[PDB]
Every structure is written in structure tokens, then in C-alpha cells.
Coordinates of C-alpha atoms in Angstrom, one line a residue:
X1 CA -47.7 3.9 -15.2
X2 CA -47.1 7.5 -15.0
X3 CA -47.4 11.2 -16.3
X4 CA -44.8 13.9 -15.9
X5 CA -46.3 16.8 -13.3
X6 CA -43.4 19.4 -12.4
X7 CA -40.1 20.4 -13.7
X8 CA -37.5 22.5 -11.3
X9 CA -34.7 23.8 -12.7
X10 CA -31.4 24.2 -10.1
X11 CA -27.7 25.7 -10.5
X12 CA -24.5 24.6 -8.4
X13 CA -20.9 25.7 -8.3
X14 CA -18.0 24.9 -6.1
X15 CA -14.4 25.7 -6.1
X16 CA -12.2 23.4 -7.7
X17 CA -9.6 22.5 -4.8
X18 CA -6.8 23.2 -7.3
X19 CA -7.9 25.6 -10.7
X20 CA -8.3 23.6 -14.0
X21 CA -6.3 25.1 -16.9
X22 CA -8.0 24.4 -20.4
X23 CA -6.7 25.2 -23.9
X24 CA -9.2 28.2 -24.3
X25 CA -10.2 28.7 -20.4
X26 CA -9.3 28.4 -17.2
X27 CA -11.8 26.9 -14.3
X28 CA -12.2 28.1 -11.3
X29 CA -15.7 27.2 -10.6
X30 CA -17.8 23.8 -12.1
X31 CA -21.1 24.9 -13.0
X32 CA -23.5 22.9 -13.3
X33 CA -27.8 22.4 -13.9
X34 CA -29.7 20.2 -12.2
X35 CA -33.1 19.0 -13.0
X36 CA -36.2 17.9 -10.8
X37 CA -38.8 16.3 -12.5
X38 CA -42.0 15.1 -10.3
X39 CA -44.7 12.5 -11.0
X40 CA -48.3 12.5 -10.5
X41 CA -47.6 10.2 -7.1
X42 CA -45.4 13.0 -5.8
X43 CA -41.9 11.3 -6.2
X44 CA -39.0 13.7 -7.0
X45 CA -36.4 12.3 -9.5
X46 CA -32.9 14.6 -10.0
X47 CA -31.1 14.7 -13.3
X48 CA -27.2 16.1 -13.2
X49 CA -26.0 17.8 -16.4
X50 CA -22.5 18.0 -17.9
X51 CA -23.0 21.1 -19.8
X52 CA -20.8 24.2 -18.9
X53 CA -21.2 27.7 -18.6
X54 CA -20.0 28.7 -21.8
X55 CA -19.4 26.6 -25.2
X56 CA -15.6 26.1 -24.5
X57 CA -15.8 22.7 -24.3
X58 CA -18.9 21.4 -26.8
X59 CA -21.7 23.4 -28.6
X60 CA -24.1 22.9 -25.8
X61 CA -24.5 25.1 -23.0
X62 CA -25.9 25.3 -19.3
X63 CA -28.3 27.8 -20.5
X64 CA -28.6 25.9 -24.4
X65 CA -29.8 22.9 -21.8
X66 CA -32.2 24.4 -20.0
X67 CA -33.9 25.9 -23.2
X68 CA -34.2 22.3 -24.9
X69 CA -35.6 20.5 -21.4
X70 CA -37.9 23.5 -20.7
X71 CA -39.7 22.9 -24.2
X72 CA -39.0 18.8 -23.9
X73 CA -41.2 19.2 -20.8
X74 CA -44.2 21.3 -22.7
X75 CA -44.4 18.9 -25.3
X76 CA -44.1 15.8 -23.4
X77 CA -46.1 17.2 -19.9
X78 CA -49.4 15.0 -18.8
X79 CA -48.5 12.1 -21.1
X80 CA -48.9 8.8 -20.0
X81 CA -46.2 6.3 -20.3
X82 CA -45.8 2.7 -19.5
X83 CA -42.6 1.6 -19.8
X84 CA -39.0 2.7 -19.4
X85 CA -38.7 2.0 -23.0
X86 CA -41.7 4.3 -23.3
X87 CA -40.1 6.6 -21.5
X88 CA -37.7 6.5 -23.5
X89 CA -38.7 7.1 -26.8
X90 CA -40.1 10.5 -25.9
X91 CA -36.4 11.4 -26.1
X92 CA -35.3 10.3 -29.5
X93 CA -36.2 14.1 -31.0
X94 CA -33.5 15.1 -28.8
X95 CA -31.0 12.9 -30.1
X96 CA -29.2 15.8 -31.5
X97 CA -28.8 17.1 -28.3
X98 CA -27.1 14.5 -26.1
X99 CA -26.2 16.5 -22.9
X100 CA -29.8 17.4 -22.8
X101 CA -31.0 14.1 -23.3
X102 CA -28.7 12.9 -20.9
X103 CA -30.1 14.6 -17.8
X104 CA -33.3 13.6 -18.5
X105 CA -32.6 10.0 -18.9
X106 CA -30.8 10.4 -15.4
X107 CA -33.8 11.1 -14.0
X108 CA -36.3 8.6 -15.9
X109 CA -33.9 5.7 -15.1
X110 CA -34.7 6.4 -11.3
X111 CA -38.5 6.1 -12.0
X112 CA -38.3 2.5 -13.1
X113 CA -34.9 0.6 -11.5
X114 CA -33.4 0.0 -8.4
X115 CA -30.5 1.7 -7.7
X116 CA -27.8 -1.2 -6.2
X117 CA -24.9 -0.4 -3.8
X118 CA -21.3 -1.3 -5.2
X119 CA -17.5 -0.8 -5.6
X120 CA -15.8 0.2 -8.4
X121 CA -11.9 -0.4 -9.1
X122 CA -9.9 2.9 -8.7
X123 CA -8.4 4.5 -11.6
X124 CA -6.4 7.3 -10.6
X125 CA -5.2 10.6 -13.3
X126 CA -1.9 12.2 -12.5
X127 CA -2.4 16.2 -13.1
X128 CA 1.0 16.6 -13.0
X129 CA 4.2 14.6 -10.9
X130 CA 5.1 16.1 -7.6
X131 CA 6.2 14.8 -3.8
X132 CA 2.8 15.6 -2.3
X133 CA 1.2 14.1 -5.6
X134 CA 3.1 10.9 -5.2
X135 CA 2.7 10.1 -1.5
X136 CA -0.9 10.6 -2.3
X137 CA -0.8 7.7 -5.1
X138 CA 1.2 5.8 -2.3
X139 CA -1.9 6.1 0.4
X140 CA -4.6 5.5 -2.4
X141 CA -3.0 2.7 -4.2
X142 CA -4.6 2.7 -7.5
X143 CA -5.1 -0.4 -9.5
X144 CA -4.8 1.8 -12.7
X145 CA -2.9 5.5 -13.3
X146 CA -3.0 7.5 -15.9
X147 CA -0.3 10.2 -17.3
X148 CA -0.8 13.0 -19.6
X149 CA 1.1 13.2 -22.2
X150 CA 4.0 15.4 -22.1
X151 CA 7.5 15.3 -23.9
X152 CA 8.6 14.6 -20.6
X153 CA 6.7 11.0 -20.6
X154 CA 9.4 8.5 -20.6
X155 CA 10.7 10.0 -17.5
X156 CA 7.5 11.0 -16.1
X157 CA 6.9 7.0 -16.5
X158 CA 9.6 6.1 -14.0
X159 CA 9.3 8.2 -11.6
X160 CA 5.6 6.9 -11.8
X161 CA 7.0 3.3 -11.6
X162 CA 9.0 3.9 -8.3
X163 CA 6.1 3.3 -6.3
X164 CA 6.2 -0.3 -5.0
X165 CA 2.7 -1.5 -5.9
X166 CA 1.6 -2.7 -9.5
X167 CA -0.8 -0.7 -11.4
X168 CA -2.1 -0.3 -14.8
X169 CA -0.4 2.4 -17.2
X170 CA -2.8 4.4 -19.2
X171 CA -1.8 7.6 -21.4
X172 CA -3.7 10.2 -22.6
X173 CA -2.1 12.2 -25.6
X174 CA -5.6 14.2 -26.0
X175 CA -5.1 14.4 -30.1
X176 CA -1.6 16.2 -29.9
X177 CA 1.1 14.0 -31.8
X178 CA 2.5 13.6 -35.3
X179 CA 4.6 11.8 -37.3
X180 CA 7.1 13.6 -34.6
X181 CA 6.5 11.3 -32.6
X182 CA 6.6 7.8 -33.8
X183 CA 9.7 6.6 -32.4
X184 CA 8.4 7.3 -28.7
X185 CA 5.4 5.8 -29.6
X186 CA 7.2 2.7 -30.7
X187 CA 9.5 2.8 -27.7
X188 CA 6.5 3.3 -25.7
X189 CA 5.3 -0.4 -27.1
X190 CA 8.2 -1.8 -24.8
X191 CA 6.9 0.3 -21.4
X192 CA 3.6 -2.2 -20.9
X193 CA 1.3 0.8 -21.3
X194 CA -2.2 -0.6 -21.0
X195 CA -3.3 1.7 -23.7
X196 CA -2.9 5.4 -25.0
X197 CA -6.1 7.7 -25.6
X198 CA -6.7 9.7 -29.2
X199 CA -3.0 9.8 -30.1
X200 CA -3.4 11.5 -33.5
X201 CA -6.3 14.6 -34.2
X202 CA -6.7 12.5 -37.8
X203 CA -7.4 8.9 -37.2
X204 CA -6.3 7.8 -40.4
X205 CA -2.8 8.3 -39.3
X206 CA -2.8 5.2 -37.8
X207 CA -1.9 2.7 -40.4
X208 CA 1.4 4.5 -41.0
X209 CA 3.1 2.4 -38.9
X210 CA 2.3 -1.0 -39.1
X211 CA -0.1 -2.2 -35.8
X212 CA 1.9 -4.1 -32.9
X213 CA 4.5 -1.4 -33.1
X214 CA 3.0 0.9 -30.3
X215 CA 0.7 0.5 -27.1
X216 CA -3.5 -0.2 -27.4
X217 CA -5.2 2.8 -28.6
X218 CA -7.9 4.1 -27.7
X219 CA -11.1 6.4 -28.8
X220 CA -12.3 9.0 -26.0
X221 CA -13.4 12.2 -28.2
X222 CA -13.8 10.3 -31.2
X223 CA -16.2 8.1 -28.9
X224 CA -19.4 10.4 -30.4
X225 CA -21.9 6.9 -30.8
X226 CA -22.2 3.8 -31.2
X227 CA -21.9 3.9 -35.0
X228 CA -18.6 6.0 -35.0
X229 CA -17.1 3.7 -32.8
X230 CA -17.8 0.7 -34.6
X231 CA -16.7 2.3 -37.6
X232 CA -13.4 2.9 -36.1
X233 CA -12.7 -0.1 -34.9
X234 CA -13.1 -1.8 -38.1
X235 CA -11.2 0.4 -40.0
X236 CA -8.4 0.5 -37.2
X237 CA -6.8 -1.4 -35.0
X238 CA -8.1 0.4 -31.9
X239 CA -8.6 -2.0 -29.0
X240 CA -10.2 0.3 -26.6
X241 CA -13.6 2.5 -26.5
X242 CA -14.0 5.0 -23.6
X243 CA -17.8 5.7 -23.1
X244 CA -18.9 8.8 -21.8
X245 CA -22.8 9.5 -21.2
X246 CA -22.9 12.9 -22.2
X247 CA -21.2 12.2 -25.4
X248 CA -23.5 9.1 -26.4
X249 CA -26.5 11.3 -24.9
X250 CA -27.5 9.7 -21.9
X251 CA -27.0 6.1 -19.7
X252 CA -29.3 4.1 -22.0
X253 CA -26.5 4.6 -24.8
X254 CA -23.5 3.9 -23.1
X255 CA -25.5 0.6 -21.5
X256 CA -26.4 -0.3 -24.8
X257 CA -22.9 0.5 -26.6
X258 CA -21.6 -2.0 -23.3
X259 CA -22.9 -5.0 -24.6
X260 CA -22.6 -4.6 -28.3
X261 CA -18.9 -4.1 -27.5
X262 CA -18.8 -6.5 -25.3
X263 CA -19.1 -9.6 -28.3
X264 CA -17.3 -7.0 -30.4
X265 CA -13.7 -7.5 -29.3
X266 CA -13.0 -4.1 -28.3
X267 CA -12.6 -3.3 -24.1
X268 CA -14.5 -1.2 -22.6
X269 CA -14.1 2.2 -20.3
X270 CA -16.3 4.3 -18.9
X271 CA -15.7 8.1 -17.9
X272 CA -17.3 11.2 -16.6
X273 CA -15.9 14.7 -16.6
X274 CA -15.9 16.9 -13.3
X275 CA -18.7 15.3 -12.0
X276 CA -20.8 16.2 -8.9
X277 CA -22.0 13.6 -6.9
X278 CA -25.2 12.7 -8.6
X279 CA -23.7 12.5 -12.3
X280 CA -20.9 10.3 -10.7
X281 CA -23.0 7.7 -9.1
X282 CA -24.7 7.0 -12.5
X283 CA -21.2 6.7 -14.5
X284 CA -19.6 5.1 -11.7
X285 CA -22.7 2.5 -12.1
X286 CA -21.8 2.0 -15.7
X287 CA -17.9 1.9 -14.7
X288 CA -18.3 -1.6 -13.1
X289 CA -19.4 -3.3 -16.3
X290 CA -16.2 -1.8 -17.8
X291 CA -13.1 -4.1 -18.5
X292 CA -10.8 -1.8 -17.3
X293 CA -11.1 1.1 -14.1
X294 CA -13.4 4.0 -15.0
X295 CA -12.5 7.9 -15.3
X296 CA -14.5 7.8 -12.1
X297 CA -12.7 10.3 -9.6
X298 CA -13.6 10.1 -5.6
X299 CA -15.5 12.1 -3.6
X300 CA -13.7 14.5 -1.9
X301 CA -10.8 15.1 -5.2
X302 CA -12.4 18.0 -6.9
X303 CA -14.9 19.3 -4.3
X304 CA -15.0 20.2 -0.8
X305 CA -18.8 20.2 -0.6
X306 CA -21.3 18.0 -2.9
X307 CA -24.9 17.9 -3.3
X308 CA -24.9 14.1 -2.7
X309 CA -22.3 13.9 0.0
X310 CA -19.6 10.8 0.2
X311 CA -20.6 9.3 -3.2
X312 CA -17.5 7.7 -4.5
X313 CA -15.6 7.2 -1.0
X314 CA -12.1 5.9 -1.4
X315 CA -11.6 2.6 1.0
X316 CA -8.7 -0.1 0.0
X317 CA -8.1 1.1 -3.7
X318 CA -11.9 1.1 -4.5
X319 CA -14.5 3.9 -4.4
X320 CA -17.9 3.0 -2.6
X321 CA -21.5 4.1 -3.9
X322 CA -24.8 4.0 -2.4
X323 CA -27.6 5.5 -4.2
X324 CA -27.4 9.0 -4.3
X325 CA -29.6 11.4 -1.9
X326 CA -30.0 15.2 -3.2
X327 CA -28.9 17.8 -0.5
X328 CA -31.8 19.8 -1.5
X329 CA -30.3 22.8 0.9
X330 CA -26.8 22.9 -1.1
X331 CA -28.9 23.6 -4.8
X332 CA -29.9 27.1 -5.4
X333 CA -32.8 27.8 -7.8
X334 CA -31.8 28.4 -11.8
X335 CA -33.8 31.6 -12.5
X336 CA -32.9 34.1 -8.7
X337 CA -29.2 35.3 -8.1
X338 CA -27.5 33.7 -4.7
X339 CA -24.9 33.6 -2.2
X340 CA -23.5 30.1 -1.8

């Protein structure tokens, strides 16, 4: 029953094997803090955090972060705590600040659990359809792939479909159609798409056209908690949630959102967003009590070099984890300026 002793702040980066291309930004680079916080029996816990460089993407920053941890820390420094419930009501004033609160709990979830060895289900995204592309999705054989949409789709969706393994079909329409685009929506209800995430920017669009006409839908960016969600799903007929740890503010969220979705009818899928290996372990962890294959991407896909190497290896259509061991030479320090 412990008290909180250190606190190191770390920065990584690694090339993206291909560049990223955003609305507002492209990437090049994933940036990313790390945390180290040490108790008073000299045990070092790591916390990865989603945060970016700059506020592209959400409010909160990699330096906006480290601000809000560094004065968590002063506060919260040479308190005893009991519990991991304990523990984790000395984050509730940070609420407000999920991606925050989600590195810490990252870390205080490793002072008080196991951390099991397991297999998740491989769910592939297609960046965009290509010959090298597809005889990659031919070696990997993914139970689950999922397209972004592109006015293209229809198409898109068989060529996707010439592969000679079944999969699920997932599309992502990342809050882009209209009332434009109803008919391939209802076309689409013919296609066995598993389900389509955030069709519409307004939600409310939803009940003009009468439910059972197109595919599942699903919440992703309207995810924001467990309230909003349950909201939604009363008031619509969305069938799917996907959870994401930094958007619900840490893993003790998304486990909790789990279960009360689990009696509530809705599926379940959990999802992490350029990852490094640390982050990924913890989401992929949460992935296997999903109902459908994670936004869980292997090792290897994005980066070259990790600072928890192999977690998220690719064998037989399923990515492997075993608890995750910090490469404490691949971190630099936050505050000094360094080669890599």
C-alpha cells in the first residue's frame, strides 16, 4: 500500500513507414510522451500517451499533457493509497482532461494487476486498394477489413471481395455523407457490411430513412463517454460503440463502458490510434473482451523500431501480446534535445 516517489517524463518519434495525410496535417513523425512513475519499493511503471504534437487532432497536447501530469504529481506526491480504486480516485479532478488521465491510469493499472499473455482476432484497415496492398491481405488473412469510404466504395468492395477467404466488412465514412448519399447507403444494406462508422457529422440525420434500410452504424468520434453513448443509442438505432481509451480518459472507462454495454444490446469495439507498443498492449488487452476485432494494428505496420519490441506480432490471422517491457535505451528524455 503505496506512495508515489518519482515522476520521468520521456519523448519518442519514428517514421511512419508510409506518411499519414490528415485533413489539416500531414504526419511524418508520431510523437509521443511517455511517463515513468516510481514507488517507494523502487518499481518503475510506464504510461504511453496519445496526445500529439500540436492540437490538430483534439484540444490536448503533448506539451498540454505534460503540464497537467507534472502538477497531478505535486498534488498527489507522498500520498498513501490502498487500493486501485484508491488510486483511482486521485484522478477524477482530471476528468476533464482524458488523454492525461489516461497515461496515468496506464501506469497505476500495472501497480495492482497481472498483466496476462493473449491473442487477439485481426482486424485489418485498407489505406487505400493496390496490388502490393492486396497480396498483403492475402498473406495476413484478416478475419475482419475495413474500407474508407470513398465514392469509389461499391467497387472498392469487390475488388476487396476477390480474395478467396471470408472476412468481415467494416466502413468508415468518418462524418462525411448527406442526404447525397442515401441510396448507396441503402444499396449498401444488400453488401453484408458488418457495420459503417459515424456516417452523418449530425446524428440526428439518422431517422430520415427508416432503420433496416442501410448497414449497423456505429459511434467512434461521437464515442466521448459512457453517458453520450448511451444517449445515442437510445435515441438511435446504432448497434455498435467503438471504445477508445484516450477518448473515455483512460482503461478503467473503456472496462467499465465494456460491461454496461455488454447487457445493453449494443456490440462492442475497441480501438487505438497510432499506437506504440506500450499504448497497444493495453488496448489490445481491452480488444479481446470486444465482440467484434479491435482497431488494434500489428507490430511492425506503422513502425520499424518500438520501444516495447514485437508487441502485437502477426501469426495465423491473430496478433500475439505478452506484457510489455520498456526499451529504456530507445526513449530520449522530455526536457534535452536529441539525435535518435
Amino acid at each position: 500500500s503505496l506512495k508515489l516517489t518519482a515522476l520521468h517524463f520521456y519523448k519518442y518519434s519514428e517514421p511512419f513507414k508510409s506518411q499519414i495525410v490528415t485533413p489539416k496535417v500531414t504526419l511524418t513523425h508520431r510523437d509521443c510522451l511517455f511517463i515513468e512513475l516510481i514507488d517507494d519499493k523502487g518499481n518503475a511503471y510506464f504510461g504511453e500517451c496519445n496526445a500529439f504534437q500540436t492540437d490538430w487532432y483534439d484540444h490536448e497536447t503533448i506539451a498540454s499533457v505534460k503540464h497537467v501530469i507534472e502538477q497531478w504529481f505535486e498534488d498527489n506526491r507522498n500520498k498513501s493509497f490502498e487500493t486501485y480504486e484508491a488510486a483511482l480516485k486521485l484522478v477524477d479532478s482530471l476528468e476533464n482532461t482524458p488523454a492525461a488521465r489516461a497515461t496515468i491510469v496506464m501506469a497505476l493499472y500495472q501497480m495492482f494487476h497481472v498483466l496476462p499473455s493473449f491473442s487477439v482476432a485481426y482486424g485489418a484497415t485498407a489505406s487505400g486498394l493496390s496490388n502490393k496492398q492486396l497480396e498483403s491481405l492475402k498473406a495476413t488473412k484478416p478475419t475482419r477489413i475495413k474500407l474508407k469510404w470513398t465514392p469509389q466504395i461499391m467497387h472498392q468492395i469487390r475488388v476487396l471481395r476477390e480474395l478467396d477467404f471470408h472476412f468481415q466488412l467494416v466502413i468508415d465514412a468518418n462524418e462525411s455523407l448527406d442526404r447525397q448519399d442515401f441510396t448507396q447507403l441503402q444499396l449498401l444494406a444488400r453488401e453484408q457490411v458488418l457495420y459503417i462508422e459515424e456516417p452523418f457529422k449530425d446524428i440526428s440525420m439518422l431517422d430520415e430513412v427508416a432503420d433496416g434500410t442501410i448497414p449497423p452504424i456505429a459511434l467512434d468520434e461521437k464515442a466521448t463517454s459512457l453517458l453520450d453513448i448511451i444517449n445515442l443509442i437510445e435515441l438511435y438505432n446504432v448497434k455498435v460503440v467503438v471504445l477508445k481509451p484516450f477518448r473515455l480518459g483512460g482503461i478503467d472507462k473503456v472496462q467499465t463502458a465494456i460491461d454496461t454495454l455488454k447487457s445493453h444490446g449494443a456490440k462492442v469495439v475497441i480501438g487505438g490510434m497510432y499506437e506504440y507498443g506500450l499504448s497497444r498492449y493495453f488496448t489490445a488487452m481491452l480488444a479481446r473482451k470486444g465482440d467484434y476485432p479491435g482497431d488494434v494494428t500489428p507490430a511492425g505496420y506503422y513502425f520499424e523500431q518500438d520501444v516495447v519490441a514485437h508487441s502485437g506480432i502477426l501469426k495465423e490471422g491473430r496478433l500475439e501480446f505478452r506484457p510489455p517491457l520498456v526499451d529504456i535505451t530507445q526513449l530520449q528524455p522530455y526536457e534535452g534535445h536529441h539525435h535518435h
